[PDB]
């Protein structure tokens, strides 16, 4: 059972640099909705300054309100920054797991090519074809039809000619 | 192609099957051989010993 001490010491940091970016965004994530909050309550408040007849009071309350929304923009474009860089971190560490993956098994196949080498195969497929040879040059060399046939008609054929034409007669 | 293909691995069968039916064929050649050795000296002896007798 293998320790990997500087692994466990990197995921330490990782997991408390990424509790604290998830704080930050929680918190944004509160202020946000605060922001939310006061922007509703500051267009019921434009809402009662125009029933009641106060234009100046409406255009005073919807300009909070704009401030406020904006505000609102800034902290939700902020909080979406922070998930990306947590984003990016998960993406760093699985990077790194794959890269560890590819390069033990490139070690692996790499001492697999070092033993059976293309060269090493290129010579016994060339002695399996020379053995190929030899045994049918020796196979073929004991099976000459000269010996069975050994004397061979001096005629050329012509009696066994005439021996066959005859059968076929009969 | 697989029909092509069978009858390729069919061809060599058969060339196969003439090298052997030829190689019996020689063995049978060289078991006749020395039959025919061997009846041929029981021959030479027997017209020696008639040919010492007269």
Excluded: C
């Excluded at 990197?10 to 509160?30: F, I, S, V």
């Excluded at 049918?136 to 000269?146: I, K, N, Q, R």
């Amino acid at each position: 059972m293998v320790k990997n001490w500087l692994f466990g010491k990197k995921r330490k940091e990782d997991a408390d640099a990424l509790a604290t970016l998830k704080g930050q965004q929680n918190r944004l994530q509160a202020e946000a909705r605060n922001l939310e909050r006061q922007s509703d309550e500051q267009k019921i408040l434009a809402s009662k300054m125009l029933k009641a007849g106060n234009k100046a009071g409406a255009r005073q309350a919807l300009k909070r309100r704009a401030v406020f929304m904006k505000r609102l923009n800034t902290v939700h474009n902020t909080a979406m920054n922070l998930q990306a860089q947590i984003d990016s971190i998960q993406t760093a560490t699985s990077t790194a797991e794959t890269v560890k993956a590819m390069e033990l098994g490139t070690k692996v196949v790499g001492e697999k090519i070092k033993t059976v080498s293309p060269e090493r195969t290129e010579r016994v497929m060339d002695s399996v074809m020379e053995q190929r040879d030899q045994i049918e040059m020796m196979t073929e060399a004991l099976s000459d039809p000269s010996l069975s046939e050994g004397i061979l008609d001096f005629e050329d054929d012509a009696a066994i000619d005439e021996q066959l034409a005859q059968l076929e007669a009969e």
